């Protein structure tokens, strides 16, 4: 439960991906199978980079769950 009490209606797995957390704290909202859920990673963990052209492509599984591992390694300094 990432949205908490103010999450909305219903509350079940079914064929839809729901709020999922991450090591760095990346809260992934509701979704579904075969859905490319992309988002710019929080590289600004101090104050580095002044462009930021990388992304985090975390697609959901086809059965109805999140993928094994997300490609967050694409994040790098401003060089």
């Amino acid at each position: 439960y990432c949205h908490r009490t103010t999450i909305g209606n219903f509350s079940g797995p079914y064929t839809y991906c729901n709020t999922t957390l991450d090591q760095i704290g990346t809260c992934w909202p509701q979704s579904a199978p075969g859905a490319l859920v992309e988002r710019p990673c929080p590289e600004y963990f101090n104050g580095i980079k002044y462009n930021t052209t990388r992304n985090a492509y975390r697609e959901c599984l086809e059965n109805g769950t999140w993928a094994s591992r997300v490609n967050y390694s694409h994040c790098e300094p401003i060089l």
């Binding site: 991450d22 090591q23 760095i24 990346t26 990673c41 590289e43 963990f45 101090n46 104050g47 580095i48 980079k49 985090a56 591992r69 997300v70 967050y72 390694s73 994040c75 790098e76 300094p77």
Partner: peptide, 15 residues
């Protein structure tokens, strides 16, 4: 920055 971005991203591979 020079030595932070690394640890920052180093924590990204864990994701």
């Amino acid at each position: 920055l020079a030595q932070e971005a690394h640890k920052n991203r180093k924590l990204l591979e864990i994701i």
